[PDB]
Amino acid sequence: MKAFILAAGSGERLEPITHTRPKAFVPILSKPLIEYQIEYLRKCGIRDITVIVSSKNKEYFEKKLKEISIVTQKDDIKGTGAAILSAKFNDEALIIYGDLFFSNEKEICNIITLKENAIIGVKVSNPKDYGVLVLDNQNNLSKIIEKPEIPPSNLINAGIYKLNSDIFTYLDKISISERGELELTDAINLMAKDHRVKVIEYEGYWMDIGKPWNIIDVNKWALDNLVFSQNLGNVEDNVKIKGKVIIEEDAEIKSGTYIEGPVYIGKGSEIGPNSYLRPYTILVEKNKIGASVEVKESVIMEGSKIPHLSYVGDSVIAEDVNFGAGTLIANLRFDEKEVKVNVKGKRISSGRRKLGAFIGGHVRTGINVTILPGVKIGAYARIYPGAVVNRDVGYGEFFKV
């Protein structure tokens, strides 16, 4: 079987994390998303894996992914289906979207054994949304309604396909489109009329990582489900530990530190003294968390440093960020309703009453910096000492007021 991972976005909805890395490389605990996909694939016996990427991102993938084929997408076009206008297959291919996280490959191993075109569907409690799956009288695919604001079903398109070379036929016959995007689903919808397209229902955990808070979502899931309490590091005397705690090799934990698990402490981390790690603290790798620093429910990526007099709650902080002494993120509005976030130029609700900030790679905040809830700070941004960040900060911007 051949597998194609469609990793060619944009990007945009996951800013500022995507200012410095393609979404396929968003970490879930210690490893990038795409590394889980590839590893699920290989557990199913699929080895011939190709990533369709953008030309911008071609170099990055090649550099990071050892034995995987990288193929840049058609530039004269954009979409899910314009991606596989770069598909190099006959017979059959497994197609997956580059931003999905799924807990188990059991469905993939199952789909590849089928001669017919098949598709995975998952039940979400918000099917709007999401292309909803219309199942005919026999439970193969009738059609997929693209984001209809009425939910005809709880079954949505899980974005895991096993398609035969017949797909190319309907890809040409499909005129595209009303967003500009040459879409896959369109082509699958004509084919579903002639061809029988099975529908397997996905059973475990699925998440498309389509908004920055979903990085918290999957990392929380993973902390709960994929790892178990262990200590491969150095813990000094007078550190209190409760609950599940992953301490990785080379990690050093200094006295006075207090950990209420579940907490993931990435390798090479230096915690303490007198730090407080609270449930769902995920330090991906080589992080510094100093004296009088408290973290709760956040993902702090590689080599990022929060060394003094800081609270980080419900946030996502990207790689090589440094907090000046006294930066504080707020995670609650004065009026305690859902925190809104600008995502591709729209103010949308996160669904979260508590939500702090989204910080790009290589950010440096001055001392005593104040960040409001749901604010995004662009990679490479510089925040003047004492400033109150009460709006989104651009990529590479200095911010004072």
Short mmCIF file of all heavy atoms in Angstrom, two decimals, residues 179 201 280 282 321:
data_model
loop_
_atom_site.label_atom_id
_atom_site.label_comp_id
_atom_site.label_asym_id
_atom_site.label_seq_id
_atom_site.Cartn_x
_atom_site.Cartn_y
_atom_site.Cartn_z
N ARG A 179 -14.65 28.09 -2.96
CA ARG A 179 -13.68 28.73 -2.06
C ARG A 179 -12.34 28.95 -2.79
O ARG A 179 -11.41 29.60 -2.27
CB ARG A 179 -13.50 27.90 -0.77
CG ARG A 179 -12.44 28.42 0.20
CD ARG A 179 -12.61 27.84 1.60
NE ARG A 179 -11.34 27.69 2.31
CZ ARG A 179 -10.79 26.52 2.63
NH1 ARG A 179 -11.39 25.37 2.31
NH2 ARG A 179 -9.63 26.49 3.29
N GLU A 201 -16.57 3.21 10.71
CA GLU A 201 -16.77 4.16 11.77
C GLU A 201 -15.56 4.07 12.68
O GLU A 201 -15.24 2.98 13.21
CB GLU A 201 -18.06 3.87 12.54
CG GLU A 201 -18.61 5.07 13.33
CD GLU A 201 -19.45 4.66 14.55
OE1 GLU A 201 -20.14 3.61 14.50
OE2 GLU A 201 -19.41 5.40 15.57
N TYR A 280 -1.53 19.15 33.95
CA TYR A 280 -1.48 19.33 32.49
C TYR A 280 -0.40 20.28 32.06
O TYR A 280 -0.50 20.90 31.03
CB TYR A 280 -2.86 19.62 31.88
CG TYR A 280 -3.75 18.43 32.09
CD1 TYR A 280 -4.81 18.47 33.01
CD2 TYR A 280 -3.48 17.22 31.42
CE1 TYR A 280 -5.61 17.34 33.23
CE2 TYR A 280 -4.28 16.08 31.62
CZ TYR A 280 -5.33 16.15 32.54
OH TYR A 280 -6.11 15.03 32.75
N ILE A 282 2.94 20.56 30.37
CA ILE A 282 3.67 19.77 29.40
C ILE A 282 4.89 20.53 28.96
O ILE A 282 4.79 21.52 28.26
CB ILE A 282 2.72 19.36 28.16
CG1 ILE A 282 1.68 18.31 28.65
CG2 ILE A 282 3.49 18.87 26.89
CD1 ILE A 282 0.25 18.78 28.32
N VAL A 321 11.34 30.56 23.46
CA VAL A 321 10.74 31.76 24.01
C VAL A 321 11.44 32.03 25.31
O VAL A 321 11.90 31.08 25.95
CB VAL A 321 9.20 31.62 24.18
CG1 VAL A 321 8.52 33.02 24.78
CG2 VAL A 321 8.57 31.41 22.78
#
